[PDB]
Amino acid sequence: MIGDYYINASALNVRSGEGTNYRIIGALPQGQKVQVISENSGWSKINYNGQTGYIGTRYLSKLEHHHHHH
Incomplete structure (x- = not known):
């Protein structure tokens, strides 16, 4: 934990x-x-409207509120 x-x-x-x-x-x-x-x-396990898939946990959206330098 806190290793994110x-x-x-x-x-x-x-x-x-x-x-x-x-x-x-x-x-x-x-x-x-x-x-x-x-x-x-x-x-990461995701099920997208009946179709199953896997994605890399490296990239996701949650670190939003991120600035593009001002």
Whole structure:
């Protein structure tokens, strides 16, 4: 705990951010439907409207409120 030092940033976080299957989904998290359930074996478990997938826990959206230098 408190070891969360991931880059996170703001990119294709729902899917397409793994490097495995980048044509399936894009980025529309927080506020919309579907979220990360839990991390398993390294990748995060997500179920996107009936279609299952895995994404890299390295990049997700939560480090928002980030400045682009002013």
